[PDB]
Swiss-Prot record, chain A:
<comment type="similarity">
    <text>Belongs to the TUBGCP family.</text>
</comment>
<protein>
    <recommendedName>
        <fullName>Gamma-tubulin complex component 3 homolog</fullName>
    </recommendedName>
</protein>
<comment type="function">
    <text>Necessary for the recruitment of gamma-tubulin to the centrosome and for the formation of a functional centrosome.</text>
</comment>
<comment type="subunit">
    <text>Interacts with gamma-tubulin.</text>
</comment>
Curated annotation (Swiss-Prot), chain E:
<comment type="function">
    <text>Required for gamma-tubulin complex recruitment to the centrosome.</text>
</comment>
<keyword id="KW-0206">Cytoskeleton</keyword>
<dbReference type="GO" id="GO:0000931">
    <property type="term" value="C:gamma-tubulin ring complex"/>
</dbReference>
<dbReference type="GO" id="GO:0031021">
    <property type="term" value="C:interphase microtubule organizing center"/>
</dbReference>
<dbReference type="GO" id="GO:0005819">
    <property type="term" value="C:spindle"/>
</dbReference>
<dbReference type="GO" id="GO:0005813">
    <property type="term" value="C:centrosome"/>
</dbReference>
<comment type="similarity">
    <text>Belongs to the MOZART1 family.</text>
</comment>
<dbReference type="GO" id="GO:0051415">
    <property type="term" value="P:microtubule nucleation by interphase microtubule organizing center"/>
</dbReference>
<comment type="subunit">
    <text>Part of the gamma-tubulin complex.</text>
</comment>
């Protein structure tokens, strides 16, 4: 796991291969605190959250498409690790309206 | 390895529609992490914290 | 949500405490450093014999 | 010459502390060791290398 | 430019008095500038509220 | 009290497909009667279980 978590720390920052040390040790600590989740597995339930979310952001067409893509996905190869993958994409889901304020002026504080 | 190439083209469609904002190389790291086993809560939590951190460091 | 938060809070406390104790002990007593003073004292008695 | 320099330096062997061509150096044995107060002492043993 | 800042200050000042607040205009003028410098509405709210908590205790 | 209560708990745990031995349940009754918070007690088992899975 160490070579993989690390490479994530280098890529995300897009720079630094030991200048990302702070972020690595931090990632390791965070992962080292034991989270427990609200619902573990079931393909249908995670898929549904993504469908409702689609409708809610006014990207109804795309929501329609996502269902085709979901079925397709199983046929290119079956996943045992899907709930977790589909969750990660869920938590990173955004709305097409509005910006999150400035976060390039927030550094100066 | 043939298999590995097909899955990523469909996966990249969901992520770009849903707004996620991960390039190809990084999207491969998470799939590795999830296969070796990770709590899902931790994985989302780091990605969000690294992103917030990165934008401030740059600016 | 609370139960998971509670369990996680205690676990951080235990971990962080371990690390801080180890750091406090290391600078507070280091056997390595004590020897080099002694070696250095042994040197001084031999210096004062050479002049 | 090696014998003369060695002899002259060691002050006829009366210096076992270092060799120096100094006639004004005070002859002092090293102060009692650190651990002497704990372990007592035994005779010192020198080497050849 | 001087008029524009002032007209803006005024429309906000009518609204503030209506929802009630002990705050003067000058601190309210800072808040607009803090929002304008970006910054998530929850961070902005918490610090403002906290200052008010600290003032009241102090006097 | 202990044996009979353990036999009933053990059967429930088997229905749940929940990996627990004889040893846990007997120790659990004894704490519960001298007073143990059920939230505290539970959390201890959930956590202990997660660690044997990480280690193993």
């Amino acid at each position: 796991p160490n070579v993989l978590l690390q490479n994530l720390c280098c890529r995300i920052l897009g720079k630094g291969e030991a200048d990302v040390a702070q972020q690595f040790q931090y990632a390791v600590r965070v992962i080292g605190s034991n989270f427990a989740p609200t619902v573990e597995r079931d393909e249908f339930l995670v898929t549904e959250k993504i469908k409702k979310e689609f409708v809610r952001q006014r990207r109804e067409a795309d929501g329609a498409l996502f269902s085709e893509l979901h079925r397709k996905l199983q046929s290119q190869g079956v996943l045992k690790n899907r709930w977790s993958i589909l969750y990660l994409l869920l938590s990173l889901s955004e709305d097409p309206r509005k910006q999150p304020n400035k976060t390039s002026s927030f550094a100066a504080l | 390895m043939s298999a590995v190439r097909e899955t990523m083209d469909v996966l990249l469609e969901i992520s770009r529609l849903l707004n996620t904002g991960l390039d190809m190389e990084t999207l491969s790291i998470c799939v590795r992490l999830c296969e070796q086993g990770i709590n899902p809560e931790a994985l989302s939590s780091v990605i969000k914290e690294l992103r917030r951190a990165s934008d401030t460091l740059k600016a | 949500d609370i139960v998971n938060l509670q369990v996680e809070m205690i676990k951080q406390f235990h971990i962080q405490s371990s690390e801080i104790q180890m750091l406090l002990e290391r600078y507070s007593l280091n056997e390595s450093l004590v020897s080099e003073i002694e070696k250095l004292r042994e040197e001084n008695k031999r210096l004062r014999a050479n002049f | 010459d090696k014998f003369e320099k060695e002899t002259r330096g060691s002050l006829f062997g009366a210096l076992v502390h270092s060799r120096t061509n100094d006639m004004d150096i005070k002859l002092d044995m090293p102060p009692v060791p650190e651990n002497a107060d704990l372990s007592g002492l035994a005779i010192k043993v020198p080497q050849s290398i």
